[PDB]
Amino acid sequence: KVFGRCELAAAMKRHGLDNYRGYSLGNWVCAAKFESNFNTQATNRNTDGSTDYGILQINSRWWCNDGRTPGSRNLCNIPCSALLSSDITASVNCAKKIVSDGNGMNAWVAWRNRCKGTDVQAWIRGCRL
Ligand SMILES: OC[C@H]1O[C@@](CO)(O[C@H]2O[C@H](CO)[C@@H](O)[C@H](O)[C@H]2O)[C@@H](O)[C@@H]1O
Ligand SMILES: [Cl-]
Ligand SMILES: [Cl-]
Ligand SMILES: [Cl-]
Ligand SMILES: [Cl-]
Ligand SMILES: [Cl-]
Ligand SMILES: [Cl-]
Ligand SMILES: [Cl-]
Ligand code: NA
Ligand code: NA
Ligand code: NA
Ligand code: NA
Ligand code: NA
Ligand code: NA
């Protein structure tokens, strides 16, 4: 599923991301935009051989099992393929564990580099939330 901006915003809010660990909804939307362009099926291989999956590009090195990432963890206790569903439930719940990990949203490279400290509020402009 390729989510619409406001559609994803609404889905993220219902799942309780809005201001989760102090991060307003626009941050989550902005992150999704630059990680996956709102595409739940987005996958990307990392240099270290691990892979990023889903709307928030969650990494198989630490958070999910894809069966081909040696010496990796599966801290969210899911197959990485669950992160690709049109139902963003798994991605949100795992993301909640990721952002709680001590570094906040800096865990998402594209967030730090492209969203952090900008008007992320603009990402939910005109949405019925
Ligand atoms: O998320 C855990 C850990 O991995 C780092 C390493 O640079 O970022 C990775 O994980 C992200 C989210 O799961 C990926 O989007 C990214 O591709 C990947 O580099 C750290 O930010 C973080 O400590
Ligand atoms: Cl939309
Ligand atoms: Cl919650
Ligand atoms: Cl593995
Ligand atoms: Cl665990
Ligand atoms: Cl889908
Ligand atoms: Cl959903
Ligand atoms: Cl980046
Ligand atoms: Na898709
Ligand atoms: Na915060
Ligand atoms: Na991998
Ligand atoms: Na694993
Ligand atoms: Na292993
Ligand atoms: Na999901």
Say yes or no: CB of residue 55 within 6 Å of ligand 1.
no
119 CB neighbour count, 10 Å cutoff: 10
Say yes or no: CB of residue 57 within 6 Å of ligand 1.
yes
Resolution of the experimental structure, in angstroms:
2.2
Q: Considering only CA atoms, which of 46, 67, 47, 55 is closest in space to residue 95?
A: 55
The angle at the Cα of 94, spanning 38 to 83, to the nearest 5 degrees, equals 50
Q: Considering only CA atoms, which of 54, 53, 86, 88 is closest in space to residue 67?
A: 53
Query: Catalytic amino acids?
Result: 35, 52
Q: Output the six-digit token pair for 28.
A: 């989550």
Say yes or no: CB of residue 23 within 6 Å of ligand 1.
no
Distance 99 CA to ligand 2 centre (A): 25
Separation between Cα atoms, residue 48 and residue 8, nearest integer Å: 30
**In a 3-state reduction of DSSP, which class is residue 94?**
helix
Class of domain 1-129: mainly alpha
Ligand 1 atom 21: residue of nearest CA: 107
Distance 38 CA to ligand 10 centre (A): 23
C-alpha 60, offset from chain centre: 13
This entry's atomic model was obtained through X-ray
